[PDB]
Amino acid sequence: EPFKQQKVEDFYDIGEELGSGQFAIVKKCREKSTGLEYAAKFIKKRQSRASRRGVSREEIEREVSILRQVLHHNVITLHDVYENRTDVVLILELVSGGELFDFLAQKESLSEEEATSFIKQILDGVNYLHTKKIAHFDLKPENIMLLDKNIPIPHIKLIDFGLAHEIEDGVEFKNIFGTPEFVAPEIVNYEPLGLEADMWSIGVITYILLSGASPFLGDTKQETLANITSVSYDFDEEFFSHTSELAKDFIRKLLVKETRKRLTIQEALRHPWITPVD
Amino acid sequence: EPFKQQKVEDFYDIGEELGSGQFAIVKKCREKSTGLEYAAKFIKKRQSRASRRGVSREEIEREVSILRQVLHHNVITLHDVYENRTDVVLILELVSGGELFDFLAQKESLSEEEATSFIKQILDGVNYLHTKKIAHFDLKPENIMLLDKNIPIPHIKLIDFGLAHEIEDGVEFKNIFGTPEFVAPEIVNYEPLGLEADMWSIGVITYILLSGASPFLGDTKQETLANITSVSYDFDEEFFSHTSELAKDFIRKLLVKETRKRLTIQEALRHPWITPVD
């Protein structure tokens, strides 16, 4: 399943840049044969050794392999993949609804019920993943897009799969990555990583989503990491002076240090605040 | 000791950009009153809360405060500091020798004696620091410049003091920062940090310096971190087929997990390979 070794140019019309992380750059584009819009991700292959620039072949494949296994509506989808000598081009689904968070900004008022809507979608998408035994490992507001903003209740789309890694049984994996703010403890304290991680983030997102304040955001990374490791957050009335205990609860069960004690996706879904039993 | 609240442009002639990390950008410049060249570092003040862009006021002061306390010839020196509303401008000494490493390149072979030369300088500068009880915490080839390359044996100059932190007695400090490759274990395993850290790097530099191969550089950060934590490196003959045991030794005593067991700067200096007793 190699990558088509042709020039993308040939089958697509590379348009404007829509974003560019670091060793990869995204530009809107078009399928020549269909006049269909797509998003083209250019992942600069690594130079050689300590090559401060470029992505490892594994990290590459690891991302691709993954994107290929996933096929859920609440998750971004990879149409095609081409490969030249400088970069590796991914033809990904195009996401225009912008960052969920931004949209929510314009929205001036959010009901928990309405909020759980989104959160739930996030869950449904994440669920697909985890089932295929996969960890996005990079869940954050900047990575929670919207298909088309133009609908009372938008379709959330998970993107950015560079930090995604396929979890295996009895094969330990630890590493330090991601935004200081959304990472769980097992990461900060270089410990065994599992799907559990992605859950912590869900909580963090929800906390932010409801209150608009980050549970662990400190003045300095130095500071934050401590909060996360020490698991130090509160439910300040200055923000949670309206929130249901049902909400807060959901939060509480996800922001837990002990892996096995923290809720699992399946668990998180059948939680009253999400799926009202009665 | 606030920052002059004037516009740098008034007393200086901002020239070309010389470098730009992230929330800070450097541009060569000139003192109007003297026609003297300097380097001007622009550190973009933080937006606000979670402000993905901008540096915390502490992080700022913490750097400045520091640079002010240091005044050694093997260490870069801060001439002045101005402060507007967008950035904070530091007037730093200008270093043209480029990166020691690059310089060393041009040279065919390198004698250990000659090598110890540089390494030693590094020590002398680091010594000054440590004595003022300070940890550069960001020692790496990219931060080891040369005053003027134009001398058989150049003047090494330590720069980049953003990660520099002042260590205090009985006041614990842990955090996760720096390049994966040059950080010591106490970092990787979010543990108590001390001047000990900087030493591990000295080792790593030397190893790279002598052999040209990095002791822990792995295919993936994921990989590297394990090497560092597991302390896994060798003295492959493919590179150390010439090196003295004396050298290798120096290395071995710095690349040590246990803080108290690793060599202290003072120790490192009085080491035969460096300061030949006889």
Curated annotation (Swiss-Prot), chains A, B:
Domain Protein kinase, residue spans: 12-274
The GO biological-process annotations, alphabetized, read as:
anoikis; apoptotic process; intracellular signal transduction; neutrophil migration; positive regulation of apoptotic process; positive regulation of eosinophil chemotaxis; positive regulation of neutrophil chemotaxis; protein autophosphorylation
Chief location of this protein? cytoplasm
Indicate how activity is controlled.
Answer: Activated by Ca(2+)/calmodulin.
Q: In the Enzyme Commission scheme, what number(s) does this protein have?
A: 2.7.11.1
Annotated keywords: Apoptosis, ATP-binding, Calmodulin-binding, Cytoplasm, Cytoplasmic vesicle, Kinase, Nucleotide-binding, Phosphoprotein, Serine/threonine-protein kinase, Transferase
* Annotated ATP binding sites: 18-26, 41
Residues annotated as the enzyme's active site: 138 (proton acceptor)
What compartments host this protein? Cytoplasm; Cytoplasmic vesicle, Autophagosome lumen
Enzyme class at the top of the EC tree: transferase
Q: Which GO terms describe its cellular component?
A: autophagosome lumen; cytoplasm; cytoplasmic vesicle; Golgi apparatus; intracellular membrane-bounded organelle; nucleus
MF terms in GO: ATP binding; calmodulin binding; identical protein binding; protein serine kinase activity; protein serine/threonine kinase activity
Stated induction or repression of this protein's expression: Up-regulated during granulocytic maturation.
Which cysteines bridge via disulfide bonds?
none
Tissue and organ distribution: Expressed in neutrophils and eosinophils. Isoform 2 is expressed in embryonic stem cells (at protein level). Isoform 1 is ubiquitously expressed in all tissue types examined with high levels in heart, lung and skeletal muscle.
Q: Which reaction does it catalyse?
A: L-seryl-[protein] + ATP = O-phospho-L-seryl-[protein] + ADP + H(+); L-threonyl-[protein] + ATP = O-phospho-L-threonyl-[protein] + ADP + H(+)
Task: Name the coenzymes or cofactors required.
Answer: Mg(2+)
Question: How is the quaternary structure described?
Answer: Homodimer in its autoinhibited state. Active as monomer. Isoform 2 but not isoform 1 can interact with ATF4.
Swiss-Prot/TrEMBL domain comment: The autoinhibitory domain sterically blocks the substrate peptide-binding site by making both hydrophobic and electrostatic contacts with the kinase core.
Q: What does this protein do?
A: Calcium/calmodulin-dependent serine/threonine kinase involved in multiple cellular signaling pathways that trigger cell survival, apoptosis, and autophagy. Regulates both type I apoptotic and type II autophagic cell death signals, depending on the cellular setting. The former is caspase-dependent, while the latter is caspase-independent and is characterized by the accumulation of autophagic vesicles. Acts as a mediator of anoikis and a suppressor of beta-catenin-dependent anchorage-independent growth of malignant epithelial cells. May play a role in granulocytic maturation. Isoform 2 is not regulated by calmodulin. It can phosphorylate MYL9. It can induce membrane blebbing and autophagic cell death.
The entry's family comment says: Belongs to the protein kinase superfamily. CAMK Ser/Thr protein kinase family. DAP kinase subfamily.
Q: What is this protein called?
A: Death-associated protein kinase 2
